RNA sequence: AAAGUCAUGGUUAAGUGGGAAACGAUGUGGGAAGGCCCAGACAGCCAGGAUGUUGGCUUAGAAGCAGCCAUCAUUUAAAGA
């Protein structure tokens, strides 16, 4: 059972996303169901060890944000073009 | 190899130790292939592939199972003397094959303690009950 | 003490063109290299290569313990082949059947090294497969 | 001696050493594997 | 040497080579040779790096070449002045951006494909890195 | 040659700073897992590297070592035709 921490993004856009990935982070979003989309930001080195498992893209993950277990699945991922890093992850609510 | 499968290789000592009563010892200053074959080619004409010629005489491995079973062996952790637990026997006839191979091209690393199964002395009691 | 095995089959007694200087190194005269080679060679069936152990005692004498011929020649009578394996995977020579090895497995269970005949059975499987002749 | 911009362990008994600011490959089994970076 | 069988036009402008690459995932095989550098690969460079990885795996496996040279390059000869036309087509290139998987392979152990994409990276003028197939 | 031999916390030992690439290298600082261990590791020292076996040919003799092939398998601590 993967558990991932997350804070809610204050600022959004092109320059703010560049400014997170410098500081060992990357933005994500959770979308699905009756509830609005939730734009969160993740820690880069914690997820990059989890993502190297083939069990990551098949199980129902749990993101903890503002004290709330949200059970989502990995829908899409943007990888860096030549560095082994992560740019952005989509999550669809389970 | 990781420690959990080593933790059944402490269990693998026990049931060999539990069944075995008589044990003879050796060391290797000049460990030859054939100097261990002298006791195993001799073993096949008597019994099976039951026996281990491997060593467990390390400062935690045969030390922990010693208050468990056969408590005299908690002193021979160091000083380079190993264990080979033959499963049957009661003062059997399988002693000097590690020891007579010392005279035949080996330079005496063992000093042949004898394991004291009737709690005997260090002298070889070559009487063998037929 | 140099107990290595070097001769050809029975038809060449005192075999100076096959042996040469090989067993002729020591101070032992050749009259017990040729005629005391016949204590096992003419003692059985001729023509087949018996290896013989020479350990040179200090009194110019020797004794030995006999054994079976190699995995070529006792299997060569069970093959009949003359050239061994001429490029097997690019064109085949033949094969060795498994069940024919039983007669030799009950033959060589006297001196050949070990007590488990069944463990010697898969020993002559892959050894027969080693000869270009897939068992 | 070999003098090369690329020096390497060529066999199993080659040791890479740095003496006075130069990477050298000194060997003990083979005299042909001795090297000096240049 | 790879080359188009036909072109609509014989010549082309020079252009620029900015941007990131598109064929970034390993699509077909299991392992890749991704481009970290920028530049252009001529057809003699693409094909010398193919003979070096084909020989290294001993005709056992399957190789993909993800890039094709289709930009013709002109040159003017020696002792020719600057006007009087555009030069004659001399060779063919492929324009490479950072993030381009160049070659692919499967059907080999991963340790054999480390060492064949090393003997073939030697013949290329851009800096490369070894990638594998990812799940999503 | 006018104005900080300024404070604080780091890095560099190359006069790098104060010219140059593919490539090479136990140079040195930092970081999350990387990755083997008190069922004694890692490095040295006490030691084998057997057995069938020399696996057979074409060759100059072909035996692990000229190349060509199978490269299994026993006595099984382990020893790879
Ligand atoms: Mg901007
Ligand atoms: Mg000097
Ligand atoms: Mg343009
Ligand atoms: Mg483009
Ligand atoms: Mg002044
Ligand atoms: Mg100061
Ligand atoms: Mg060590
Ligand atoms: Zn060397």
Curated annotation (Swiss-Prot), chain A:
- Per the UniProt entry, what is one GO biological process? ribosomal large subunit assembly
Q: Which residues form the signal peptide?
A: none
Q: Name one GO molecular function term.
A: 5S rRNA binding
- Keywords from the UniProt entry: Ribonucleoprotein, Ribosomal protein, RNA-binding, rRNA-binding
Answer whether the UniProt record assigns the keyword RNA-binding to this protein: yes
Example of a GO cellular component annotation carried by this entry: cytoplasm
Assembly, in brief, is: Part of the 50S ribosomal subunit; part of the 5S rRNA/L5/L18/L25 subcomplex. Contacts the 5S rRNA.
Q: What does this protein do?
A: This is one of the proteins that binds to the 5S RNA in the ribosome where it forms part of the central protuberance. Binds to the 5S rRNA independently of L5 and L18. Not required for binding of the 5S rRNA/L5/L18 subcomplex to 23S rRNA.
Give the family per the record. Answer: Belongs to the bacterial ribosomal protein bL25 family.
Protein's name according to its UniProt entry = Large ribosomal subunit protein bL25
Q: Which organism is it from?
A: Escherichia coli (strain K12)
Q: Which gene encodes it?
A: rplY
From Swiss-Prot, chain B:
Highest taxon, organism lineage: Bacteria
The UniProt record's further free-text remark is:
Ribosomal protein L8 appears to be an aggregate of ribosomal proteins L7/L12 and L10.
Q: What is this protein called?
A: Large ribosomal subunit protein uL10
Sequence intervals crossing the membrane: none
**GO cellular component terms, A-Z:** cytoplasm; cytosol; cytosolic large ribosomal subunit; large ribosomal subunit
Keyword annotations from UniProtKB, A to Z: Acetylation, Repressor, Ribonucleoprotein, Ribosomal protein, RNA-binding, rRNA-binding, Translation regulation
Q: Which GO terms describe its molecular function?
A: large ribosomal subunit rRNA binding; ribosome binding; structural constituent of ribosome
Q: Which residues carry this modification: N6-acetyllysine?
A: 36, 104
Q: Does the keyword Oxidoreductase apply?
A: no
What portion of the full-length protein is represented by this chain?
2 to 131 of 165
* Gene Ontology terms: biological process: cytoplasmic translation; negative regulation of translation; translation
- Indicate whether Membrane appears among the record's keywords: no
Quote the function comment for this protein.
Forms part of the ribosomal stalk, playing a central role in the interaction of the ribosome with GTP-bound translation factors.
Oligomer status and interactors = Part of the ribosomal stalk of the 50S ribosomal subunit. The N-terminus interacts with L11 and the large rRNA to form the base of the stalk. The C-terminus forms an elongated spine to which 2 L12 dimers bind in a sequential fashion forming a pentameric L10(L12)(L12)2 complex. Two L12 dimers associate with a copy of L10 to form a very strong complex (called L8).
Family of this protein: Belongs to the universal ribosomal protein uL10 family.
Which gene specifies this protein's sequence? rplJ
Curated annotation (Swiss-Prot), chain C:
Modification N6-succinyllysine, positions: 67, 76
Q: What's a single GO MF annotation on this record?
A: structural constituent of ribosome
What is a single Pfam family found in this protein's UniProt entry? Ribosomal_L11_N
Specify whether rRNA-binding is a keyword of the entry: yes
| Record PTM N6,N6,N6-trimethyllysine, positions in chain | 35
Keywords per UniProt: Methylation, Ribonucleoprotein, Ribosomal protein, RNA-binding, rRNA-binding
Question: Could you list the residue ranges forming a coiled coil in this record?
Answer: none
Entries under InterPro entries matching the protein: Ribosomal_uL11 (IPR000911), Ribosomal_uL11_bac-typ (IPR006519), Ribosomal_uL11_C (IPR020783), Ribosomal_uL11_C_sf (IPR036769), Ribosomal_uL11_CS (IPR020785), Ribosomal_uL11_N (IPR020784), Ribosomal_uL11_N_sf (IPR036796)
Q: Which domain of life does this protein belong to?
A: Bacteria
Kindly give the SUPFAM superfamilies that the UniProt entry links to this protein.
Ribosomal L11/L12e N-terminal domain, Ribosomal protein L11, C-terminal domain
- Which terms does the UniProt entry file under GO BP? cytoplasmic translation; ribosomal large subunit assembly; stringent response; translation; translational termination
Gene Ontology cellular-component annotations: cytoplasm; cytosol; cytosolic large ribosomal subunit
The answer on whether this UniProt entry bears the keyword Ribosomal protein reads: yes
Q: What does this protein do?
A: Forms part of the ribosomal stalk which helps the ribosome interact with GTP-bound translation factors.
Report the family membership.
Answer: Belongs to the universal ribosomal protein uL11 family.
Q: How does it assemble?
A: Part of the ribosomal stalk of the 50S ribosomal subunit. Interacts with L10 and the large rRNA to form the base of the stalk. L10 forms an elongated spine to which 2 L12 dimers bind in a sequential fashion forming a pentameric L10(L12)2(L12)2 complex.
Protein name according to UniProt? Large ribosomal subunit protein uL11
Please give the organism: Escherichia coli (strain K12)
Its gene is: rplK
Curated annotation (Swiss-Prot), chain D:
Keyword hit for rRNA-binding: yes
The protein's role, per its UniProt record? One of the last ribosomal proteins to be assembled in the 50S subunit, it contacts a number of helices in the 23S rRNA, acting as molecular glue. The simultaneous presence of uL16 and bL36 probably triggers ObgE's GTPase activity and eventual dissociation from the mature 50S ribosomal subunit.
GO MF, any single term: structural constituent of ribosome
Q: What is this protein called?
A: Large ribosomal subunit protein bL36A
Q: Name one GO biological process term.
A: cytoplasmic translation
Q: What domain of life is recorded for the organism?
A: Bacteria
What is one term from the GO cellular component aspect held by the record? cytoplasm
Q: Which parts form a coiled-coil structure per UniProt?
A: none
Q: Which PROSITE patterns match?
A: RIBOSOMAL_L36
Arranged from A to Z, the UniProt key words for this protein are: Ribonucleoprotein, Ribosomal protein, RNA-binding, rRNA-binding
């Amino acid at each position: 059972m993967f558990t991932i921490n997350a804070e809610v993004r204050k600022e959004q856009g092109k320059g703010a996303s560049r400014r997170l990935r410098a500081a060992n982070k990357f933005p994500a979003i959770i979308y699905g169901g009756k509830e609005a989309p939730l734009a969160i930001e993740l820690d880069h080195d914690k997820v990059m060890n989890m993502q190297a498992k083939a069990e990551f893209y098949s199980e129902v993950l749990t993101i903890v944000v503002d004290g709330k277990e949200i059970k989502v699945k990995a829908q899409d991922v943007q990888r860096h073009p030549y560095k082994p890093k992560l740019q952005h992850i989509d999550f669809v609510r389970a | 190899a990781l420690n959990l499968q080593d933790k059944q290789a402490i269990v693998a000592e026990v049931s060999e130790v539990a069944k075995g009563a008589l044990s003879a010892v050796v060391a290797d200053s000049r460990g030859v292939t054939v100097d261990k074959m002298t006791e195993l080619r001799k073993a096949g004409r008597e019994a099976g592939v039951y026996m281990r010629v491997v060593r467990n005489t390390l400062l935690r491995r045969a030390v922990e199972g010693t208050p468990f079973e056969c408590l005299k062996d908690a002193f021979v952790g160091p000083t380079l003397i190993a264990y080979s637990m033959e499963h049957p026997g009661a003062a059997a006839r399988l002693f000097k094959e590690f020891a007579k191979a010392n005279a035949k091209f080996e330079v005496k690393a063992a000093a042949f303690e004898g394991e004291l199964i009737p709690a005997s002395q260090i002298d070889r009691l070559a009487t063998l009950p037929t | 003490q140099a107990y290595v095995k070097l001769q050809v089959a029975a038809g060449m007694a005192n075999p100076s063109p096959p042996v040469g200087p090989a067993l002729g190194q020591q101070g032992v005269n050749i009259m017990e290299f040729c005629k005391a080679f016949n204590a096992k060679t003419d003692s059985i069936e001729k023509g087949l290569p018996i290896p013989v152990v020479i350990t040179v005692y200090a009194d110019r004498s020797f004794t030995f313990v006999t054994k079976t011929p190699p995995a070529a020649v006792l299997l060569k009578k069970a093959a009949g082949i003359k050239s061994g394996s001429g490029k097997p995977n690019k064109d085949k020579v033949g094969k060795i059947s498994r069940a024919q090895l039983q007669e030799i497995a009950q033959t060589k269970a006297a001196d050949m090294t070990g007590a488990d005949i069944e463990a010697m059975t898969r020993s002559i499987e892959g050894t027969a497969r080693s000869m270009g002749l897939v068992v | 001696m070999k003098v090369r911009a690329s020096v390497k362990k060529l066999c199993r008994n080659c040791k890479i050493v740095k003496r006075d600011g130069v990477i050298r490959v000194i060997c003990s089994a083979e005299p042909k594997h001795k090297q000096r970076q240049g | 040497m790879l080359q188009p069988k036909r072109t609509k036009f014989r010549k082309m402008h020079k252009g620029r080579n900015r941007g990131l690459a598109q064929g970034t995932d390993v699509s077909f095989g299991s392992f890749g040779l991704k481009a970290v550098g920028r530049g252009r690969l001529t057809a003699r460079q693409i094909e010398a790096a193919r003979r070096a990885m084909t020989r290294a795996v001993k005709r056992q496996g399957k190789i993909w070449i993800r890039v094709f040279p289709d930009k013709p390059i002109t040159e003017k000869p020696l002792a020719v002045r600057m006007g009087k036309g555009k030069g004659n087509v001399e060779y063919w290139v492929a324009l490479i951006q950072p993030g381009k998987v160049l070659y692919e392979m499967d059907g080999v152990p991963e340790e054999l494909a480390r060492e064949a994409f090393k003997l073939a990276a030697a013949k290329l003028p851009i800096k490369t890195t070894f990638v594998t197939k990812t799940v999503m």
